[PDB]
Amino acid sequence: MDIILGIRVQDSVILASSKAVTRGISVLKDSDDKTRQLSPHTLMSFAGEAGDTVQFAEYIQANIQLYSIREDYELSPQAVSSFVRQELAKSIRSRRPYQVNVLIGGYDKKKNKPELYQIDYLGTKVELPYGAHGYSGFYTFSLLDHHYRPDMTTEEGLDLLKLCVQELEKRMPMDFKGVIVKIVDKDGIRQVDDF
Amino acid sequence: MDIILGIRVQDSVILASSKAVTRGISVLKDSDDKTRQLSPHTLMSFAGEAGDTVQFAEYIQANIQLYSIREDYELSPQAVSSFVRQELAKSIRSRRPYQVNVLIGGYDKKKNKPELYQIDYLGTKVELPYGAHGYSGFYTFSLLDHHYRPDMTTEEGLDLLKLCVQELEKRMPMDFKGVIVKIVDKDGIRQVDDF
Amino acid sequence: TTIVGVKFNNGVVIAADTRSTQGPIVADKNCAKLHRISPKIWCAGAGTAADTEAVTQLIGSNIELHSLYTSREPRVVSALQMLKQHLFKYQGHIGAYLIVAGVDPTGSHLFSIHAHGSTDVGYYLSLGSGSLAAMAVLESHWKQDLTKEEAIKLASDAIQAGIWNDLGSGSNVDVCVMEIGKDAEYLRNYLTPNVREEKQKSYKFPRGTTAVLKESIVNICD
Amino acid sequence: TTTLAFRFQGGIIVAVDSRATAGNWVASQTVKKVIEINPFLLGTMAGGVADCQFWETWLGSQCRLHELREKERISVAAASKILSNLVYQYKGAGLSMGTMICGYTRKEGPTIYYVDSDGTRLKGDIFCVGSGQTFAYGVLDSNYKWDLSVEDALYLGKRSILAAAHRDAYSGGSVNLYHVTEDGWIYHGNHDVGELFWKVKEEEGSFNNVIG
Amino acid sequence: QFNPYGDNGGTILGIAGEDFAVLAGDTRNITDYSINSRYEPKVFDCGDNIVMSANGFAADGDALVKRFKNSVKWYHFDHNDKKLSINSAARNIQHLLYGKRFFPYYVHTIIAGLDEDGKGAVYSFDPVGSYEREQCRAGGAAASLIMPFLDNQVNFKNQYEPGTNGKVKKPLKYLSVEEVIKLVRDSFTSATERHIQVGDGLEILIVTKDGVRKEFYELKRD
Amino acid sequence: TSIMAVTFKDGVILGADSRTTTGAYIANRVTDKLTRVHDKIWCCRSGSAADTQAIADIVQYHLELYTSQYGTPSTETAASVFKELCYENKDNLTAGIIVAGYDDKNKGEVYTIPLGGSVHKLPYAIAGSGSTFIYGYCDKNFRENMSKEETVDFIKHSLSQAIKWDGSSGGVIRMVVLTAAGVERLIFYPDEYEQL
Amino acid sequence: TSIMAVTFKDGVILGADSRTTTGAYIANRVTDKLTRVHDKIWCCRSGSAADTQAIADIVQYHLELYTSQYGTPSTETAASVFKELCYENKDNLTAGIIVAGYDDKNKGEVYTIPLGGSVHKLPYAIAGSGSTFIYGYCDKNFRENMSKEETVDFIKHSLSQAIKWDGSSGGVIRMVVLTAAGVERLIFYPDEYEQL
Amino acid sequence: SDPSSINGGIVVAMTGKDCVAIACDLRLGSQSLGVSNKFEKIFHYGHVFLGITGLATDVTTLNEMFRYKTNLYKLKEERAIEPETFTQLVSSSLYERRFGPYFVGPVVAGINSKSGKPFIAGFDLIGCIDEAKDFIVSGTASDQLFGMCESLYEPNLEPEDLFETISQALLNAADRDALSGWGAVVYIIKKDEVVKRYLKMRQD
Amino acid sequence: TQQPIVTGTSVISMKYDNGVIIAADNLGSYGSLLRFNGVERLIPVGDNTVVGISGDISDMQHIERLLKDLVTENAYDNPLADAEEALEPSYIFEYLATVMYQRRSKMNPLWNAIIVAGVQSNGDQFLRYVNLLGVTYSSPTLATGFGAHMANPLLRKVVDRESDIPKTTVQVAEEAIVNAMRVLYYRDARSSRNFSLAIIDKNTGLTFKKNLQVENMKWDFAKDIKGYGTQKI
Ligand SMILES: *[C@@](C)(CO)[C@](*)(O)[C@H](Cc1ccccc1)NC(=O)[C@H](Cc1ccc(OC)cc1)NC(=O)[C@H](C)NC(=O)CN1CCOCC1
Ligand SMILES: *[C@@](C)(CO)[C@](*)(O)[C@H](Cc1ccccc1)NC(=O)[C@H](Cc1ccc(OC)cc1)NC(=O)[C@H](C)NC(=O)CN1CCOCC1
Ligand SMILES: *[C@@](C)(CO)[C@](*)(O)[C@H](Cc1ccccc1)NC(=O)[C@H](Cc1ccc(OC)cc1)NC(=O)[C@H](C)NC(=O)CN1CCOCC1
Ligand SMILES: *[C@@](C)(CO)[C@](*)(O)[C@H](Cc1ccccc1)NC(=O)[C@H](Cc1ccc(OC)cc1)NC(=O)[C@H](C)NC(=O)CN1CCOCC1
Ligand SMILES: [Mg+2]
Ligand SMILES: [Mg+2]
Ligand SMILES: [Mg+2]
Fold first, then answer.
1. Domain H1-204 is of which CATH architecture?
2. Which of A7, B169, E1, G54 has a CA that sits 20 to 30 A from residue I42's CA?
3. Which pairing describes strands C20-22 and B26-29: parallel, antiparallel, or unpaired?
4. In whole angstroms, what is the distance from residue B50 CA to residue D98 CA?
5. Ligand 2 surroundings by CB, under 6 angstroms
6. Class of domain D1-212
7. Which residues neighbour A87 within 8 Å (Cβ) at sequence distance 6 or greater?
8. Is A63 left (phi over 0), alpha (psi -120 to 50) or beta?
């Protein structure tokens, strides 16, 4: 875990998530996908404590998929984010809390708008034009404050994202082995293979 | 600091030392030379506590240079390594010890032989065909156990060294921003600029 | 806090200051520390502010239900028994230090309760951070066979000692007089010896001083 | 604190914020974090205020004594090493300093040295130091080229502090700008973030996260 | 284990005008929840038209003032009775404080006077010697209450010219000694209301080219 | 506290000081540490005021319910109930209780129950912080089958010394006399006992 | 330890038990806690055996050097030297010393020096762990200007009670009589004092 | 790791002549890192306004909880809850979590629709009601707010004057606190109109 | 770094029209054990100053020796040692204040709270406090330990500010001090009944009263207190 970013542009939400899984002094894997598709137009990236992350992601995934089958209907990104926040808000006062931070990128088909939510392990939800968890934010927020515009295209968003990854690769102490980038828009979720 | 390696081959000693200087969540510099020339045919690399490293290296450098001027003669690598060990052996029982680990690569002109010494902050000296300090050793020693031969050339030693750096870049958690490589032989000390 | 209780001829009087603190900051300059458990049983509370209010309301609620069940006016010893058993059960974690007083068919009474659940009996008592300042006055001026007006004077004087000399107490003096055969009279702000002086200047700003970015009407209706 | 200084075609830019903090209490908004050692040397301050203020002033006295004794202005390397050797003597005692010794001499040219309280001393072209260093790095790195004009370099330095002033809770107040040339340092004014932010937002079109 | 430090409470305040400067401080001295003295001055005339106050731990405060007063005395002996300028005093105090960097004087120090151009000057220090000249500074227990009020009323922060769309700031201007004393008195009465360690009395020392004048005002004693 | 209970010819007498402390501050200088759990079974309370109070109230309840079913309980029975509470809750209690009662068959009896919750039947018992200072005196002066006036003097002199040396003890000396005649309360003020 | 020193008509008597403990083990059951710092100035030692020993030896040295120059030192002088050592080294010492001596001008004198290193001149003094149990007894029984036989009985009965209750005290009761006549050592065995 | 000062923020409420004002900053951070500049801390249930400072997750949770409770109240009572009653509901709900509390500093503000009286109230994290004629403060810059309010405030201010006073109180307090600021919102509340104004403040 | 062993409790004092009064009980406590009963904690210096000391008694006895030595040293080569160059209360205090602060700064304090009461050569009343931390302050009434919490409130009812001092007589002042000593005996668990009192007047000089006792105590109401709540017997 470690680096997860998110950028909402005019017509899409773009999520970037590091590929490294490190344990001790060994990088065990360099192709890890730190994300789950909750629904056709909703993607969730995650970072935090080992084990907790995937266990939580898949648990949320199962619940949203259950809802979809029951109602034959897709929950809005806002509704999914509120469900996720409440689960984390319960968790923090449990015997053993989930130590997982998430970004939820979705395209609301009723509003025809992209939406990005940042939720930490305490259950602190905020809707944002761009988001980050962990130490990444200390570089990317100021960078995006400068270069981000609300009316950008998906291509402009990807170039803006390349600028973030370059900065992180230059100044971050750890080798996070690049990122997997995914785009969420009106046509659903797709992965950029060459980044 | 962090990664310092050393390989003794047939006719030379090759020292590789990482270029990164990290402090907190920021890589402050990516072109740092973690070495000092003690004498024309003796090079010392170093790694450890911030401040201590350079302060110790330059202190040793000044003493060896003083000796050279006084006697109009170059101390053997064995003699320099023994001097360095004793300084660290004093240091460990001081009020505030030098927390510095060093490798000393030298070419003995009287014996016409390359010599590599590994000395830790406690003052633990060993002569070796190949050496490493810190977490690097946990990968490089086994690698060199397999691929190293005592009669290798300087070029073969550099290829053997490339194999170590590649392994470290693949499996080490931190980005150490590559290495500066230096060769110590009968003609003195020179730096490989393209590594 | 500073709180006191004083017995007299035909009843009992309790008093309290009106300062509430958060560390060195005065949170409330005129809070009410005198609490009604039943019409003629009143409680002065020091310690954790929420705990004194919550524990006094709970027992007060149960006392009302008990009074209705038994068709009798509630007794001070019942409130005392219920409070102490509740506080003891929580091993001091409910930080309520109370002076319980009142009149009932048995007579007039005065008790104190500590957070861990121990109770005392006395003719004069004081609790809180300014209890030593108050008790010094009570030990100096108290006597047997006090009148109503003498006991009020003694009680308020003991509170004043806390107000002036204790940093954890200040502002005003509240009093409650519980006399036998009469209605209890709650004297909110009986003394107000700490009125703020006129300010030197009016800090009313010229309209338009504050820079505004947006305006909008908020909808409160359905 | 957020302080930076970077080398470029036209010399050195040095930019700092002006906030001082005691925990979450904002102690000052008008603090001076650049100390003018001589007409060709500057020192930036980050970390303990007293530590920085006291020892960099002291550094200035040592630099003056050098030029009296040697009849020559002290080198940037020698000036930085006086400070680094001093704090190394105190290593462990609890001094808190992140400083940058920026200046020009004939033998060196424009030079920047990072010096901190653990005894680290580094020569380099770009550094950002302070609690908000990462925020400054983000903007500075992503816009830096060697061939920046004096006008563009001054703005980038100013804009990088503004970026950090905005995001970092323990940075802010105002931006102090300096430009170091072969002829010495030149002050380029105090710029209050109270006005600068809105001016930059409007003119540049940036800071879209903020309610306009 | 022995704790060499203590907290004696109180608060101080310095404001600079065009041709004058004031240094105010309450006269209350405390430990924990007890009042030690209702009138214990901590603002002192140190000679050469310099007034000084070191608020926090009184033992360290008195020690510092004593050492600085002595520093002024020896400055005269060593430099032919030359007047110690306020800027020179400030630098001297930094060295006094930083001299004990690893066993600090637990005090927020403020000095006031006139600069070498005759204009009002206030300097303020942290416990280990960092200093800065300002128009305005509150120090001590109630510094966090008073300082933002001073930002607003002395430096006109967040105040814009009415009708200018929050584009033109309220222009900076020097305040008259009458206006400054109004702000000091209102600052201290406000601090007295909400801070338990502040009260009893207010003593203001005013510094002009003619010398050092004093003014005293009663504060609430609760 | 300084407390004691002493058996004698006609029954038993309980004795106690009247000081309650919160640190070095005296929260109550007129405390009643002698408490009734039954008509002629009383106890002296030392240790935590809240703990001993809560215990005594539970015991008083148990003996009231015992009396309703089986008639007057023995002093031994009362001590057993105290023990049961003190022993089973030893980890959460700080209570040193002396139990004293008068039967007509068994006459005067004294049981002491220290911190651990053990039971010890004795001719007389001393307890509380101030008892340490009078072990020597009480051992030398106690005699079996004393008269009422002798036992009152024995307790008065003993507690006077305990009060004199122990800062945690003081105020008045309360006493409770348990005989076939009935229950008698006695009080003795500083001006009398201090100059013994 | 239980130790005491008592002034009387003809001079002063020092008394002590003979038990030394290392935990609950008795390292020495025949200890001599009464030690000579001068011909007719002696001390009782309580607290750390090593500390009190090292102090007494330094005092004995000081008084021997005092006597060589200025003649016989007063009992007050001896107490002052003990104080000086105990007070100045209070952080590194655990010593409770009673100093007792006989002058011809001042007769019998007793000075007690507790942990802090303060000095207190008294008619009699008690100290050590076992003294706590006899404050009551000793206060009630002590009289000024007692005879030798009365003072010996007072000390014997007192230490007997201290020994009885204190586990850290026991063995024999040693005594040292300081009068104009000279120095007399007394010993009293368990079989005598236990059944007092 | 002090729950009440991880995210930061402030709320202040004041009374005027036949009106009340309640204001809050917009910052949400994670210690030094500023994360959001749109995080409003004032909510309303009918005509009763509630501001909440402290740990942001609990701010959100309590809002959702009081919306829940006031909705059921209205369905059963067939009327909007009043400020005095809502104040009691807040106190009950907070004390219910006595030994595992919400790390919050709530502030109630509104006008009783029956009597027309302006009402404000404050609470600690554990439920203790703090009623006031003049003003209530809450958050990481409470000391600053206390000082600003105590000096600037005067009774019976008109809605337009009250706006200036409360705004200047919040702004100058926020500027002396590292964890507060990044924008501000002020609600002016009259008997049957409510005006919401966003303030221009320094963004550092 | 110390811990106090044998300790003395409250010292109380106040100013009146012509001079100052100071008082302190004669007890030397050893924790909860009330060990020593003949301890004098008021120490006169000359005929114009009394130093009252609470806290550690070994450190008190050290301070006694210092004051005793100060008198000796002041007399050396001083023909006016009993006249113009006699030790003033202000000199004695400043000396002690210096020592106290120096010892705290060396992390080895004299574990005491000290009140220096006296009358200056010009007739002015002197009353000032100093403690183990080197903290100093002055007030019309001063008290240490429990005295600060219980005596000061009572003494301030007589002299609440500077202007009340001329209006207060020695009879009224002593009465308040003696009353305060009684209150402390009721409520302080480390206090004794026996105490000493000293009056330093600008006309009548130093009057040192020993072996005073607390009297006129109210204990009779105790007979009426039964149980802790429900007990009727
Ligand atoms: C005086 C003022 C104490 O200084 C009184 O005891 C007073 C009693 C009182 C009763 C009813 C209404 C108002 C006031 N107590 C307080 O004002 C009290 C002081 C206090 C603070 C912290 C404590 O923790 C051990 C105990 C007492 N102040 C409060 O209770 C304030 C309003 N609340 C808090 O500070 C929140 N605390 C509550 C306890 O849990 C931690 C957070
Ligand atoms: C930004 C604001 C983050 O701190 C900067 O680093 C700033 C740097 C600076 C340099 C010169 C002039 C002004 C400002 N640093 C501070 O403002 C600094 C933060 C800090 C506090 C304490 C530290 O010790 C661990 C280190 C850094 N603030 C101060 O120095 C404040 C004004 N003073 C104190 O906290 C007083 N302390 C200092 C340490 O000794 C005890 C007393
Ligand atoms: C003498 C005075 C001291 O041991 C007695 O034992 C006395 C017995 C007594 C007092 C009143 C009524 C009946 C019997 N005990 C006390 O006065 C007692 C001292 C004590 C406190 C706590 C203890 O451990 C839990 C042991 C002894 N005082 C109190 O209980 C007072 C009312 N409360 C406090 O001091 C506050 N305590 C609460 C418990 O936790 C520690 C703080
Ligand atoms: C009675 C027995 C207990 O207090 C006396 O005080 C007795 C006095 C004595 C004994 C022999 C000769 C002259 C006087 N003291 C001891 O027997 C003493 C107990 C004691 C030990 C350590 C202390 O703190 C430092 C205080 C009291 N016993 C010893 O000194 C024995 C010989 N040694 C040990 O127990 C080992 N100690 C060494 C010191 O550190 C702790 C372990
Ligand atoms: Mg007060
Ligand atoms: Mg034995
Ligand atoms: Mg900021």
1. 4-Layer Sandwich (3.60)
2. E1
3. unpaired
4. 13
5. D 1, 19-22, 27, 31, 33, 45-49, 52-53, 96, 130-131, 170; E 104, 126-128, 130
6. alpha beta
7. A56, A59, A60, A98, A123
8. alpha
E strands, E77-210, are 107-114, 120-125, 131-134, 136-140, 201-208
Domain C1-222 CATH assignment equals 3.60.20.10: yes
The verdict on C106 touching F (C-beta cutoff 8 Å) is: no
* CATH code assigned at I221: 3.60.20.10
Q: For a ligand 2 pocket test, name from D16, D49, D99 the mutation site with the most ligand atoms within 8 angstroms of its C-beta.
A: D49
* Fold of the domain spanning G1-196: Glutamine Phosphoribosylpyrophosphate, subunit 1, domain 1 (3.60.20)
B133 contacts in chain A (CB < 8 Å): none
Q: How far is CA E163 from CA C207, E155, E170, in A?
A: 9, 20, 12
Q: How was this structure determined?
A: X-ray
Candidates F1, F17, F169: which one to mutate for ligand 3, based on the most atoms within 8 Å of Cβ?
A: F1
SS3 sequence of C139-152: HHHCCCCCCHHHHH
Q: Which of H176, H200, H201 sits opposite E148 (nearest CB)?
A: H176
I1: nearest CA partner in chain E: E2
Q: Would you name the residues of D annotated as active-site residues?
A: 1
Please answer whether residues I186 and I221 qualify as being in contact, where contact means their C-beta atoms are separated by less than 8 angstroms.
Answer: no
- Considering only CB atoms, which chain C residues are within 8 Å of E159? 205, 209
Q: Are G1 and G169 in contact (CB under 8 A)?
A: yes
Let me know: does C108 contact C139? Beta carbons within 8 Å: no
- Bridge-based pairing state of the strands B4-8 and B130-133: antiparallel
Distance between CA A176 and CA A135 in Å, rounded? 12
Alpha-carbon Rg for chain D in angstroms: 17
Handedness of CA G12, G18, G24, G28 (dihedral sign): positive
A119, β-bridge pairs:
A102, A125
Query: What is the full DSSP assignment across I124-181?
Result: -EEEEEEETT--EEE-SEEE-THHHHHHHHHHHTT--SGGGSTT--HHHHHHHHHHHH
| Any ligand 4 atom below 6 A from CB of G33 | yes
CA distance A172 to chain B (A): 6
- The domain spans of chain G are 1-196
Question: Ligand nearest D193 Cα, by number?
Answer: 7
Q: Which two tokens stand for residue H198?
A: 């966003």
How far apart CA G100 and CA G84 sit, in angstroms, is 17
For ligand 3, whether the C-beta of F92 sits within 6 Å is no
- What span, in angstroms and rounded, lies between the C-alpha atoms of E148 and E13? 12
What is the sign of the dihedral through the CA atoms of I62, I64, I68 and I71?
positive
Does residue G18's CB lie within 6 angstroms of at least one atom of ligand 4?
no
Query: How many residues are recorded in chain C?
Result: 222
Q: How far is CA B189 from CA B12, B106, B126, C41, in A?
A: 10, 9, 22, 96
Residue F66's φ and ψ, nearest 5 degrees, are -60, -50
Which distant-in-sequence residues (6+ apart) come within 8 Å of I156 by Cβ?
Answer: C164, C165, I140, I141
DSSP summary character for residue A43? E
Question: C-alpha distances in angstroms, H14 versus C211, G42, H127, H137, H156?
Answer: 19, 80, 20, 9, 10
Question: Which residue shows structure tokens 């337009």?
Answer: H160
Instruction: Count Cβ atoms within 10 A of the Cβ of residue C181 and give its class: 0-12 exposed, 13-18 middle, 19 or more buried.
Output: exposed
Instruction: Give how far the C-alpha of residue B142 lies from the chain's centroid of Cα atoms, to the nearest Å.
Output: 19
Q: Which amino acid is at F184?
A: E
Q: Chain I interface residues facing chain E, Cβ-Cβ under 8 Å? A: 1-2, 101, 104-105, 107, 109, 129, 133-139, 148-149, 152, 161-162
Inter-residue contact I161 to I140 (CB < 8 Å) = yes
Instruction: Give me E111's structure tokens.
Output: 């000095």
